[model samples]
Target: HHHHHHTDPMVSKGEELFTGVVPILVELDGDVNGHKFSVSGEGEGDATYGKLTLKFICTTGKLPVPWPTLVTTLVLCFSRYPDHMKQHDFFKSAMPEGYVQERTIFFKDDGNYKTRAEVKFEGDTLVNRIELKGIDFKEDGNILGHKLEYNYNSHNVYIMADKQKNGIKSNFKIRHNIEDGSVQLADHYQQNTPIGDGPVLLPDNHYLSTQSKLSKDPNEKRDHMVLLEFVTAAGITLGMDELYK
Candidate 1:
């Protein structure tokens, strides 16, 4: 009797063919597990398409204040400093309880609470915006105001004479809305010289710029200095792309 060696057809194919193919298997080892089986025709093209996607779910807390409203409130409150001390007092009292004054680097006493005070206003003086000077409070009182001036296509507020020196004056533009307030500093090309510690307020949304004398000569100093321009929120938003580069 003749008996052929026992041989499995699947085992024979696997030994002959599997060693010649470089199979690329992607394994996702995570919280799930499974096995997959597939077959492709011989002599198939070298390229194949496969896609795997994943998703994750999680819980998060609510955001305290919407950015737009916060920015709008900041711009309005700062810009609307009443011209008279009494008006300022009334406005300060009316502010929401626990309102905190914003801080900056330049103020004396390192901008601690002692050096800062709740903003106060006076009179019916309509202010487009406000600026502060860096002189000692005992010498300059640290407060300055500017009236709004707008041309056909652009609007700006001037740096009051109290803050101006030579021909190079300093001023800021009021920028309002979401985009400008979010990225004002990153978008402006001009350098900002911090004038004081307290927050400088404006009517809307804006960033401050300083103009300096270009010439050292006392006579040419004022004439040669370039006209400093204040950038509005809209301008800042548009200019940010270039400023970043």
Candidate 2:
């Protein structure tokens, strides 16, 4: 039997998945489920890959807007919670209709939507920094824009700033907290000193738990950070391999 495959897959207007097919070779774990933030991930080695989404998930009823507009809200939206953020963080959905999506995290990058990523490491352990290549920050990119390097320690973060233009190369100062994390794109590495106000990052369990705070279990330990992914449609799959220790 002979099988012929189309280079790009196209879908109808009513169908949600992008009709045009973009072929990428890699393996990964995770499913884009849940309404606000659902997650999934498995395996490593040559059989591993990560992903992101094209559109940001919103309330089922709220009218969907362009991606850039969503990004604007994270950094430029109403100044209710805090004034500054490193990347993008929201304790709850963006508006009254803004409820959680089945996504693990929100896609709020202006004109940038990641498809997949592959992270590399120095050793089988966390003795050294781990680097990730080909972090697709745009539609036409892979290993082209937005690379990331990280470790078990929260402070150890390497990022591809402005990967396309005016790109800044430096070790970002990161503040890892229980519920959320923040990154400072500054030279100041001082732990206690005031670092530039950065964006907030949501930890999946923390987010869900807090939102579900019938009271507060607040014990044991489930450190798996949620990387929301959408499986129903090919939107995003934010997955990662564990840092070896």
Candidate 3:
């Protein structure tokens, strides 16, 4: 039993885009059909070099979507500054036109708010630009930004929000049930209380997960994972509580 706030974030002034601690790495598997995903800031050698979002790389099947650049799926602002995943070069080697491309689009909060993102590319360069709509007075220059480059060197990403201001910054990773076609968001913050902001929306995984099981079909078991990128690309993860209902 959960609630819907078609008003608060998604459709309100600025659809609530609750950013996490650091812009961690977004690992994607599957495509527009159904998808599975995860995020992390843990790595081998350096912490900065450790977790950066990698381009959504497909292992078994091709991406069902037709776009070449969907970095917005990974460019969510939880902290500040612009950064990217580590595996771009591997994918860039394949694309011909945009080993370096630039574009601008609105991160739609269900047509309620239009968060602006200035996405760019330059041989694995980190991300660029962040702006939240619906705030007044200091929304423009009131920057909470991230600063990092897209290289193997220390991917030192910084959160630019002033410390004097008190607010909640959450972090977590998403998990996909590969066996069943269901997804769930995991609390990276390891939140200790049930009364918290997130994994904000709990999904109705059991029902659909169970339904897929009853079908006894191979393709049905696989499609859930494919749509993940599309959901995130749409800025509305089905794993989010209301979408499943």
Candidate 4:
């Protein structure tokens, strides 16, 4: 029996890895959590993705609304006393509800909601100019009962918000220059409204960046400016990274 037994081992060398049942490959499928994922090698790129929901968040709920409308009143409550507003259970829940959301195509440079952007180098620092156009705040939007009309046409930018409560109707128009952080408010509701004369307060510490109040707390005011600036760059960058396949 020993002489007849095969001296060969039970196994032979594998010609190829046993990967037929389980193939060896690399791929990406579906979204991570709820956000799409992609890879990039360069910093700047085109927005080659589809439509995206652009959500704008104004921290501190101190965002400024034109004049003393219902929206303004609410904003004032938050700005005047952040701590107190936090304590109110109802107010706390409602504060974040007032946000701006726009559905836009990332690849489209011109549309109802479009952004024009450019970059320049001044000294060692890179300066960015981002402008938003056709940003509408209508009653049909997420925020109920308020309508805001945004106009931005190659440097001629302005905003309008309806002033109506208890069946009385009027309007307040806002013209702002981010270059100087100056805002001018005009009221169709009243004659000779004092705020119309000069740069007035908006919200989320918008009052801090005005000719009247030159002293701006960097911590508070800079954050607000960054929010406005970040949206365009963020939207474009996010779109560039998002892919269907």
Candidate 5:
């Protein structure tokens, strides 16, 4: 929940509230039958440094029942990337070229270590998935180097890909999946059927809405075809934009 050096004014204000410096005011009345509540903190250190944290809590006194504590955490965490995107300009500039947009992934690791993943998009459509390699994986098991793929859409939002022999469990994928209800991590991690509306965590055809633009221009179609080709080979896509970004 700690961050630094944000340039956006709205994000800066949000960061102040997320870190608990600013108290969130709420008005509630009537019975507490089915209600949802959230509190966020944001802070700025000087003019250029900032941070944000958000916590949500919800309760339902009917039917199947759900854990308010877990739900709140999930919703708050799930909103992080999207909120960050809305608040940062350097992030947008770091986006891969030819792609219309990009998202940066943050993974919490053991101790103070962190793993970073970046996805570049053609508008809301993801066109690339990149991970930083070179970190030692001996503690985990037989390690493969880092991976980069292109043209894969991650609309499902689940964190775990089908576990592979040399696969490194992605931090971005893990945290995201937990929030989306695809996987639950307690003593151990387990898969669960998601309830309620969740963010797109993995790429799937369901996300291809009718509003999605399809290229008709010959040049754009050609580029799209090339992207598909890479997707076929890597089961993902990677390109110059991915590397530099």
Candidate 6:
């Protein structure tokens, strides 16, 4: 029902990612077990803190999935960076701002699992990283520490994933170049000898390049939003459209 040009400077790739103006609708959907489920609805707040009101629904080829007939709605909330983390000795000396804590919930039949991440900025104005901390299984609600931190450097990114749990620490020196248009061969240690693995891909939740549609009005641009998607290897797509107003 609405359209805008791609030249709007307010919604430009750099503006939206770093200096987002408003809050807008975000969406997520996944195909699993031959069914597609979507979640989205009313959400509050801007780049800082907010609560997402979600409506979950699933559909099959001819019939709507009924397994989730009971709980159709869920609320996910985000808040400012924890004070405790800041108060800690490690960060007290060089405390930073423009960070918000986030936890993503994944529903399972018996229980649910959660992954933690955060919206982080390079300085005050540049939104530079989408830090994925790791997951917590429902069985014990205990965190299985992992890190898949993404750092935006130039038009490329440096991705680091933690070593598998309960195993020796592993190293990540993978660099993804946007100009190459694909993943590159990286070192993988098997025993003490390193081997090469290639043709890889990764997810993006930050601005990798500059592109956008023009806002209807720069004055009303704060009421507009943009979508940032994170797709998985299994083809599941999850997205968030930032809102400013």
Model 6 lDDT, full chain set: 0.23
What is the clash count for each candidate, in the order shown?
A: 15, 32, 26, 6, 27, 10
Write the residue-wise lDDT of candidate 5 on 62-155 in tens digits. 2111121121112111122333233322222222231111122222331111112232323423222221212222233211111211112222
Q: Residue 131's C-alpha lDDT in candidate 3?
A: 33
| C-alpha RMSD between model 3 and the true structure | 21.9
**Best of the candidates, TM-score:** 6
lDDT tens string, model 2, 88-132? 222112211121111112222312222222222223210101111
In candidate 6, stretches whose alpha carbon ends up further than 4 angstroms from where it belongs are 1-24, 46-77, 84-245
lDDT of 4 by residue, 67-116 (tens): 11111111111111122112211111211111121112121111122322
**RMSD after CA superposition, every candidate:** 32.8, 22.7, 21.9, 27.0, 22.0, 20.4
Position 126, candidate 5: lDDT: 24
lDDT digits (tens) for residues 7-81 of candidate 3 = 223222111222122222333332211232222111111111222323233333433322121233323221111
Compute each candidate's TM-score over C-alphas. 0.15, 0.15, 0.19, 0.19, 0.20, 0.23
Alpha-carbon error at 157 in model 1, in Å? 13
Q: Which ten residues in a row have the lowest lDDT in candidate 5?
A: 225-234
Model 2 accuracy (lDDT, Cα): 0.20
* Superposed model 2: Cα runs more than 4 Å off: 1-168, 178-224, 228-245
Query: In model 5, where do residues sit more than 4 Å from their true spots?
Result: 1-3, 20-74, 82-245
Measured with C-alpha atoms, the lDDT of residue 228 in candidate 3 is: 16
Clashing residue pairs found in predicted model 6: 5-214, 8-214, 21-244, 22-243, 22-244, 22-245, 23-243, 23-244, 24-242, 24-243
Evaluated against the true structure, the overall lDDT of model 1 is: 0.20
Worst 10 residues of 3 by lDDT: 205-214
